[PDB]
Amino acid sequence: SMSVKKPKRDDSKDLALCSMILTEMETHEDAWPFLLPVNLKLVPGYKKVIKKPMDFSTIREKLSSGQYPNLETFALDVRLVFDNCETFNEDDSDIGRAGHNMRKYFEKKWTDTFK
């Protein structure tokens, strides 16, 4: 509350560390469904169904331009990529499996780096 604070966590490396995680996500062999924004002209139903499209290139641009105020907002966008994927793609499909794989990959890096 006012004048009552927990000890200050060092957040000075967060930006660099989220960048490193994102690089690792970008270079994973199963990243291909997520590298670029879904083409809303060429994929029927995507625009109407997925209210907040997100992809790794868009996260990278937001990260590089100071549009994440903290590491929780960064994680929310990464998770949105996978939540969107599950919304639109059957589990038993290449893209559906890719999304589950990438989510697991992310969540381990996230825990190992920050928890």
Curated annotation (Swiss-Prot):
Domain of life: Eukaryota
Location in the cell: Nucleus
Disulphide bonds in the chain: none
Tissue specificity: Expressed at varying levels in several tissues, whereas a smaller transcript was expressed specifically in testis.
Domain Bromo span(s) in chain numbering: 9-113
Protein family membership: Belongs to the WAL family.
Function: Regulatory subunit of the ATP-dependent BRF-1 and BRF-5 ISWI chromatin remodeling complexes, which form ordered nucleosome arrays on chromatin and facilitate access to DNA during DNA-templated processes such as DNA replication, transcription, and repair. Both complexes regulate the spacing of nucleosomes along the chromatin and have the ability to slide mononucleosomes to the center of a DNA template. The BRF-1 ISWI chromatin remodeling complex has a lower ATP hydrolysis rate than the BRF-5 ISWI chromatin remodeling complex.
UniProt subunit comment: Component of the BRF-1 ISWI chromatin remodeling complex, at least composed of SMARCA1 and BAZ2B, which regulates the spacing of histone octamers on the DNA template to facilitate access to DNA. Within the BRF-1 ISWI chromatin remodeling complex interacts with SMARCA1; the interaction is direct. Component of the BRF-5 ISWI chromatin remodeling complex, at least composed of SMARCA5/SNF2H and BAZ2B, which regulates the spacing of histone octamers on the DNA template to facilitate access to DNA.
Protein name: Bromodomain adjacent to zinc finger domain protein 2B
Gene this chain is encoded by: BAZ2B
Residues of the full protein shown: 2054 to 2166 of 2168
